[PDB]
């Protein structure tokens, strides 16, 4: 039933604001933690339990921690509108940043802050009776997100063991960039993330900018739009735990159905009825139209074209007024298409889910109100193209040791760069080998 969210660094805290705004408005908890209800009977509504626990006075409080090394963003959360919702202990802040250095987060500064984080996670886990995973939001381009995210995932993986850890990760875009040292941090992050995560969802800001320009009519988008879209995706994936439906899907079913081999746990995400209010009155939104939408490359939230690879598994989440016969007819029609190909060892390529609760509309939001939506996460060999361009940029910088003196001075051996680069090279070879048709090797 319940899940605990850990937000690290700047992207993770700002995405957390959008997520908790959506979860509050969807369940109906007031910004001060209240929950008005005028009927004295019919209070048996446990759905909040997945994200909130109630105190003996009836206040609701959310199952989240906010972790950052600079104070400004969490102090902005402390003085904002949701001041009374969070317990002040949950908003954790250090004194100084990791200065875009993975080495400062991992070796020098995160070792001091990590034990407080583990004590907080323990304090959450003691107020639980059926934890079935952690949701983690972070970007691998920055210093504290990379270093402390790796250190915290390692400690969580030793202490809690088999419990699932699901990551939503913002990778450095292939040509949009914000800092020079992004390749080193992204390679070193990916090395740790390979061993210590159960499912990793990949996002690229360049794709969400393209989607917001083409489908929505926004000329000058800003991070609040992207974060609201991400919150909607997470709400769609966790809706299967919280509301009634025809075919429910527990979070363990995603990992069992989408991951064929233990290293192949990186998934693509897309969302279908991204449409504006003015467009919404011009179109019907049947099951087959939105099912066709999640497979168009114009719908992807990562800059990769799945037509350059083969699908291994697809998980289709339908929410709203949908009938199973229409889902079956849509999936059979998609299967007929010639630009969609599955590896010959995966005959039953699809998993379906159907939930009755339609997606919520947020007062300041930019999405239209729609009666049904579908969200897709899929595992495909095309992602190998995403790693190769990062590897080329890392090789370009590392050939002249362009910035290594900061990392070696702050405490890391130069050997660690070569180890991580060879391990990610082996991951690229794994994705090359797994995609070879068995009919060719006889």
């Amino acid at each position: 039933r319940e899940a605990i969210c850990i937000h690290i660094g700047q992207a993770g805290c700002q995405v957390g604001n959008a997520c908790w705004e959506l979860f509050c408005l969807e369940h109906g908890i007031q910004p001060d933690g209240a929950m008005p209800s005028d009927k004295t009977i019919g209070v048996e509504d446990d759905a909040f339990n997945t994200f909130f626990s109630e105190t003996g006075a009836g206040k609701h409080v959310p199952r989240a921690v906010f972790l950052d090394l600079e104070p400004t963003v969490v102090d902005e959360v402390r003085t904002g509108t949701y001041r009374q919702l969070f317990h002040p202990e949950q908003l954790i802040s250090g004194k100084e940043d990791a200065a875009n250095n993975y080495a400062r987060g991992h070796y020098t500064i995160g070792k001091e802050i990590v034990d407080l984080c583990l004590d907080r996670i323990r304090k959450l886990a003691d107020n639980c009776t059926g934890l079935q995973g952690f949701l983690v939001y972070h970007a691998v381009g920055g210093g504290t997100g990379s270093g402390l995210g790796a250190l915290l995932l390692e400690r969580l993986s030793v202490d809690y063991g088999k419990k699932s850890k699901l990551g939503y990760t913002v990778y450095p875009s292939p040509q949009v960039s914000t800092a020079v040292v992004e390749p080193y941090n992204s390679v070193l992050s990916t090395h740790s993330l390979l061993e210590h995560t159960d499912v990793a969802a990949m996002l690229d800001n360049e794709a969400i900018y393209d989607l917001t320009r083409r489908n929505l009519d926004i000329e000058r988008p800003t991070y609040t739009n992207l974060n609201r879209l991400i919150g909607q995706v997470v709400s769609s994936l966790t809706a299967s735990l919280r509301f009634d439906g025809a075919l429910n899907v527990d979070l363990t079913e995603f990992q069992t159905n989408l991951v064929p081999y233990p290293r192949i746990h990186f998934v693509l995400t897309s969302y279908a009825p991204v449409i504006s209010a003015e467009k919404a009155y011009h179109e019907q939104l049947s099951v087959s139209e939105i099912s066709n939408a999640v497979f168009e490359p114009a719908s992807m939230m990562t800059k990769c074209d799945p037509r350059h690879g083969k699908y291994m598994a697809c998980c289709l989440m339908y929410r709203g007024d949908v009938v199973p016969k229409d889902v079956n007819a849509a999936v059979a029609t998609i299967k007929t298409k010639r630009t969609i190909q599955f590896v010959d060892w995966s005959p039953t390529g699809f998993k379906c889910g159907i939930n009755y609760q339609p997606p919520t509309v947020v007062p300041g939001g930019d999405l239209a109100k729609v009666q049904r939506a579908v969200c897709m996460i899929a595992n495909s060999t095309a992602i190998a193209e995403v790693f190769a361009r990062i590897d080329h940029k890392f090789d370009l910088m590392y050939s002249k040791r362009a910035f290594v003196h900061w990392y070696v001075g702050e405490g890391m051996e130069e050997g660690e760069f070569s180890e991580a680069r060879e391990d990610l090279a082996a991951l690229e070879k794994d994705y090359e080998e797994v995609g070879a048709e068995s009919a060719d090797m006889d």
Partner: protein
């Protein structure tokens, strides 16, 4: 995260007075020291530059040092002079004589213990110390010699903190003093070991900014010191206000310097608009980016078109889209690709801050690490060698006690700095 300022010599104290006027205005501090601001956002980070006196008062974290009290009496007589703590004014009893050796060896060792005592007293009061900020000229006498002495002592005492310097260097044409090459060469020698990051400004470039861009009929040193105070207060803006993509002096240093000797940077500030053409152009991100890279708006005599950019940084203030920033920096790098060093895939860092300077809708400050800086040092070295061969004024310095071997060492070190810049300047795809 608090910065301590040091102001040295006449130029440093004069620039400092305007800087503390600008900062006190931006945070709404009256010259009596009383808070008069109009939003809580002003108060909540006042600690960064001010210390708290008992019930209301604010004191500016600055040490004023000079060898003749004329300047300190002028700043104390100024409109904001009262704000400064009296014990923070350090002065001697005889002048530097425009001589580096006097400032370094004779009056320097006499005063230096009292400045370190004051800076440590000021430093140890902070709960966590961020870098120091120092303003001085390299062409003067007490500024160059005692400033670099103090910098060396602070680097011994605080090697884990940040050291940041703003430095004025003599134009080859506006000669106010005959012995400028000696003071400049010895100061650059001190700076390349001691400093973490040093910014260089030509007074000739500020005159060309004023005359061509602002078309001022009768500029004064108040205008030049206002331009400098504008850039100085802009670099720290992300330290002390919220924003969508925070940045920090240490993050700038980590992203700008590929190798530890290459730490000298150019400065510019974009939204300078002429006195009679303001109704004709609205502020926008294309306008700021186009003005920001125009060499008319750069504060050194060397022009970027004769060199190549290793790295650059832009700090934006105001409510603006990240999409416009990222796509502008990509388009500028792609369209002018020959002027960007090719073994780095993206040379520009961006940062965005919510709170603009008062009375402007938007502003950007630009920091650039460009090899054309070698032209300033080469010019200073030519002028130094021409005089030294014949011993033009050397007896003053030798009479103070310097060995002649110091001049050849300092010349060799500056020549090696020029060579290091020159190799990266002229590389090509081969």
């Amino acid at each position: 995260r608090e910065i301590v300022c040091v102001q040295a010599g006449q130029c440093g104290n004069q620039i400092g007075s305007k800087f503390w006027e600008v900062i006190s205005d931006e945070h709404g501090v009256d010259p009596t020291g009383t808070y008069q601001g109009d939003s809580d956002l002003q108060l909540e980070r006042i600690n960064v530059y001010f210390d708290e006196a008992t019930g209301g008062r604010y004191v500016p974290r600055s040490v004023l040092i000079d060898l003749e009290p004329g300047t300190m009496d002028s700043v104390r007589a100024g409109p904001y002079g009262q704000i400064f703590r009296p014990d923070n004014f350090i002065f001697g009893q005889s002048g530097a004589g425009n001589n580096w050796a006097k400032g370094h060896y004779t009056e320097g060792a006499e005063l230096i213990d009292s400045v370190l005592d004051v800076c440590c007293k000021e430093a140890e009061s902070c709960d966590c110390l961020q870098g120091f900020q120092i303003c001085h000229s390299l062409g003067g006498g007490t500024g160059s010699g005692m400033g670099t002495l103090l910098i060396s002592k602070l680097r011994e005492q605080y090697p884990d903190r940040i050291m940041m310097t703003f430095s004025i260097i003599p134009s080859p044409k506006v000669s106010d003093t005959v012995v400028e090459p000696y003071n400049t060469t010895l100061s650059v020698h001190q700076l390349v070991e001691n400093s973490d990051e040093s910014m260089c400004i030509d007074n000739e470039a500020l005159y060309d900014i004023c005359f061509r861009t602002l078309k001022l009929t009768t500029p004064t040193f108040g205008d030049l010191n206002h331009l400098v105070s504008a850039v100085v207060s802009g670099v720290t803006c992300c330290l002390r206000f919220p924003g969508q993509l925070n940045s920090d002096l240490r993050k700038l240093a980590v992203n700008l310097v590929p190798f530890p000797r290459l730490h000298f940077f150019m400065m510019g500030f974009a939204p300078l608009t002429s006195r009679g053409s303001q109704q004709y152009r609205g502020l926008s991100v294309p306008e700021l980016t186009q003005q920001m890279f125009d060499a008319k708006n750069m504060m050194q005599a060397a022009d970027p078109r004769h060199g190549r950019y290793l790295t650059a940084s832009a700090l934006f203030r105001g409510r603006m889209s990240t999409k416009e920033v990222d796509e502008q920096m990509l388009n500028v790098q792609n369209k002018n690709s020959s002027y960007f060093i090719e073994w780095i895939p993206n040379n520009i860092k961006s940062s965005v801050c919510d709170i603009p300077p008062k009375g402007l809708k938007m502003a950007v400050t630009f920091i650039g690490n460009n090899t054309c800086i070698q032209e300033m040092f080469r010019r200073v070295g030519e002028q130094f060698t021409l005089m030294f061969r014949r011993k033009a004024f050397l007896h003053w310095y030798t009479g103070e006690g310097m060995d002649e071997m110091e001049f050849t060492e300092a010349e060799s070190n500056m020549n090696d700095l020029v060579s290091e810049y020159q190799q990266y300047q002229d590389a090509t795809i081969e």
